[PDB]
Symmetry: D2
Subunit: 237 residues, 4 copies
C-alpha cells in the first residue's frame, strides 16, 4: 500500500472502527484508527481552520482546529516521522462522503517545511500558499473527484451546480513538488500546514471528513476509500 500520515477532521463517528461517539480530530499513522483523538464541536456551514505542526527535535505531530467565536479542539501524538515516511514525500488534502454527505470545500491552504543543516548557510525551505484556486491549477495534482476554480475554491468532493453535496465521492489535491523531510546533515526539520474549510450538509449527520496528509510521492486514491476511509486507506486496519 501507500504510507500515510494524516490529521483527520472526521465528521462521522464510525465506532465499529474505534471512532469516539462524536465528531473528532485525529492523528493517523498508517491507519484510519487514529492513534489519538480529541472531541470536535463541528459547526455545519461555518468556515473553520486547521493547523498542523511538527519538528524532528521533539518528534510530536500536533493539530488544532477552530471556528471564530468558538473554543479550539487540539490533539498531539509522539511519533518520529523519519521512522514512518520516506525521505521524499508529497503533502496533500483528501476528503470523502459515503451514504452520508457534505461539502468538503477548501477556501485556502498553506504549507511551510524547513530542513536546517549543520553548515552555517543553513536552511532548505519550501512554502506555498493558496488563498485562491483557479480552474486549471498546474501546481496541484487533483485525484478522484477533486476540482478547483468553483468560486475560487478547491472542492475535494463532488458538489452539484445547485450548491448541493453528493454522496459516495472521494477526492484529493497534492502539491506538485516533492517535499524533502530528512537530509544527511539535518539538525532540525520542521513543517507546518494551515487550511481553511467549509463543511455543510442538508443532513444532521454529515460525513465523512477532511484530512491533511503526507504520503509517498506516487500516492493515489485507494480502491473503495470513499466514506469512512477518507480517501487515505484501502481498509480499516
Amino acid at each position: 500500500a501507500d504510507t500515510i500520515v494524516a490529521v483527520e477532521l472526521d465528521t462521522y463517528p464510525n465506532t465499529d472502527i474505534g471512532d469516539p461517539s462524536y465528531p473528532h480530530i485525529g492523528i493517523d499513522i498508517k491507519s484510519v484508527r487514529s492513534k489519538k483523538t480529541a472531541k470536535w464541536n463541528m459547526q455545519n456551514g461555518k468556515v473553520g481552520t486547521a493547523h498542523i505542526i511538527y519538528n524532528s527535535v521533539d518528534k510530536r505531530l500536533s493539530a488544532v482546529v477552530s471556528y471564530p467565536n468558538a473554543d479550539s479542539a487540539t490533539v498531539s501524538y509522539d511519533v518520529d516521522l523519519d521512522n514512518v515516511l520516506p525521505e521524499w514525500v508529497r503533502v496533500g488534502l483528501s476528503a470523502s462522503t459515503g451514504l452520508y454527505k457534505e461539502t468538503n470545500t477548501i477556501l485556502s491552504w498553506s504549507f511551510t517545511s524547513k530542513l536546517k543543516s549543520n553548515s552555517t548557510h543553513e536552511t532548505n525551505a519550501l512554502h506555498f500558499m493558496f488563498n485562491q484556486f483557479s480552474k486549471d491549477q498546474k501546481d496541484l495534482i487533483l485525484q478522484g473527484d477533486a476540482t478547483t476554480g468553483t468560486d475560487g475554491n478547491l472542492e475535494l468532493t463532488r458538489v452539484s451546480s445547485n450548491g448541493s453535496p453528493q454522496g459516495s465521492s472521494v477526492g484529493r489535491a497534492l502539491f506538485y513538488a516533492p517535499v524533502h523531510i530528512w537530509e544527511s546533515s539535518a539538525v532540525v526539520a520542521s513543517f507546518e500546514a494551515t487550511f481553511t474549510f467549509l463543511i455543510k450538509s442538508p443532513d444532521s449527520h454529515p460525513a465523512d471528513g477532511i484530512a491533511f496528509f503526507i504520503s509517498n510521492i506516487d500516492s493515489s486514491i485507494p480502491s473503495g476509500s470513499t466514506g469512512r476511509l477518507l480517501g487515505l486507506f484501502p481498509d480499516a486496519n
Copy 2:
C-alpha cells in the same frame, strides 16, 4: 521555440552578437542579444551573488550582481512579462561552456513569487530555498550536464572528479512545480530570485555564463546551445 526571459551573468564577450567587449550582466527577452547590459567585474574563483526582482505594477525586470568587498553591477529593463511569458511558467538556472570554459557552480538558490488578488484574503505565494543540493534532488528537473550533490552543490556544467571544468557543456536546473505569474483577479504580481555562484577557470578568458531564467513549463535545452547561447536559445537572433 521555447519562450525565454533570462538575466545573464555572461563571462565571455561575443561582440559579433552584440555583447559589449567585457564580462557583463544582461536582461534577455526572447533573444541572447540582451535588451540591456551593464559592465561586470567578474572575479575568477570568488563566490558571487545575483538578485533578480520584478513586479507587474512597475513592469521592470532588474538585477544586481556582487562579490564581497566589491562594488555591485546593476541592470534594468522596462518590460511587461505578462505580454511575453505564458501565465504558467517554470523558473530555472542554466549555464554553458564552449571552446572556452569554467565551473558553473551554484552554492544556493532561492525564489519567491506572490500573486495578490483583489479579495481581502489576498496572497497566492510560492517560495523555495536551496542552500544544500543533494545527490537525488527530486524537486529539481536537471537537464543536459547539470548534476547535484557534489560538495552539496549544483554543478550546471561538467566538472571532472579532479575539480577541473570541461568545455562544450550545457546544463539546466528547473524547479519541479510550475509558477503562476498571472491571475484573473491579480492586483499585484511580484517575484524575486537570488543565487550564489562560484565561476572558476584555469583560463584568463572563461566562458560562457550563468542565467537565471523563466520559461514555458516543458522548456528543454535547445540543440547546439552550448557556448554563447547559454543553454537558452537555438540561435543568436
Copy 3:
C-alpha cells in the same frame, strides 16, 4: 518639520491644494500635494486593501488599492528614497477627519523590509503582521486619537461607542522598532506594506483619508493637521 513619504488614500477632494476633483490615491514626497495621483472609486462601508512597494534598484514607489469585485487603482512615482529619508525611519499609518468625516478603521497591517548586503550571508530583514489589534498593543506607538482593541481593530480616528465617526479627529499608529532603509554595504533595499481598511460615513462626502507613511523616528502629529493635512504635514505647501 518632520520628513514624510506617504501613500495617501485621499477621500475628500481639496482642489484648492491640487487634489483632482474625485477621491484618489496619491504619492506624497515631503508635501500633501501629491507628486502623482490616480482616480480612486472609493466604496463607502466596504473593506478595501492597499499595497505599497519599493526598491532601491528601480527607485520607484508604487501603490495599488482595491475592493473585491472591483477594478484596482494604481499610482507610481520615480523617487530615490535614500535622497529623501534618513537611513533610520519609522513606518506607520495616519488618518484624519475635519468638518467632513468617516471611520478610519484598520483591520490588518503588514510590512516587510529587506537590506541585502554584498556579503554572501546577505539579508537584513524586518517583518510584522497585524490581523488582530489588542487593547494594549505594546509594539505600536499610538498618537493623537488612534486607539486599538475595539473589535480587534485599529481606529485611527475617533469613533463613538454607537459606531459613529467623529469630525476634527487625527490619529497615527507607528511600529515601535526603527527600520533601517540604507546600509554601507547594501546592494538592494526593498520594502512592501499592505493594509486593509474600512472607511464608512453617514455622509455622501466623506473625509479626509488614510496614509501609509515613512518618517523620521521621533515623528509626531503636526499641529492643526486634522482634515486635509491627513495628520502628516503642518501646512499645504
Copy 4:
C-alpha cells in the same frame, strides 16, 4: 527580580551550581541551574549555530547547537511559557566572561514569533533577521559591554582592538520591539530563534557562555551577573 527563560550555551562547568563536568547546552526557567542539559562538544574558534523552538500546543522549549562537520547537541524541556513569562516580553542575547574568558561574538541572529487567532484572518507575526550588525544599530538595545559594528558583528562581551577577549565582562542585545507571546483568541503561539556565534579563547578553559533569552520588557543586567551568572540572574538559586 526579572523573569528569565534562557537557552544557555554554557562553556565553563560550575559543578558547585549543578553544571555537569563539561561544556553543555541548558534550558533555564527562572534559574541558572538548568532544568535540563546535554553535553556540548564546544569547538574553540569555530563558528557555531544555535536553534531554539517552541509552541503552545506541545509546550516544549527545545534547542539544538551545531558546528559544520560535527554532530549536533540537543536539549528539550516540557514547560508552559504562558505560566512563566508575562504576555509581553523582550527577546535577546546575553553573554559573560569572568576570571576565565572568551570572545562572545554574534555573526547573525533571527527570530520569528506567530500568534494564530481563531478568526479566519489568523496570524499575528514578528520576524527579524540580522546578518550584519552596524555601528549604530537603532533596533537593538545594547546593555553592559555589548557593542555592534566591529567587523559587522555583535560583540556581547569586551574585546580589545588587538582581537583579544577581556574577562569580567557582561553584555546583552535585546530587540527594540516587544513581542506578544499570548493573546485572548490565540489557538497556537509559536516562535523560533537562530543565532550564529564565534567563541574563541587563548585559554584551554574558556568562560562563561552565550544565552538566547526571553524576559520582561524592562529587563536589565543584574548586579554581579558576570561570569557563571551569564548576565541573566542576580544569584545561583
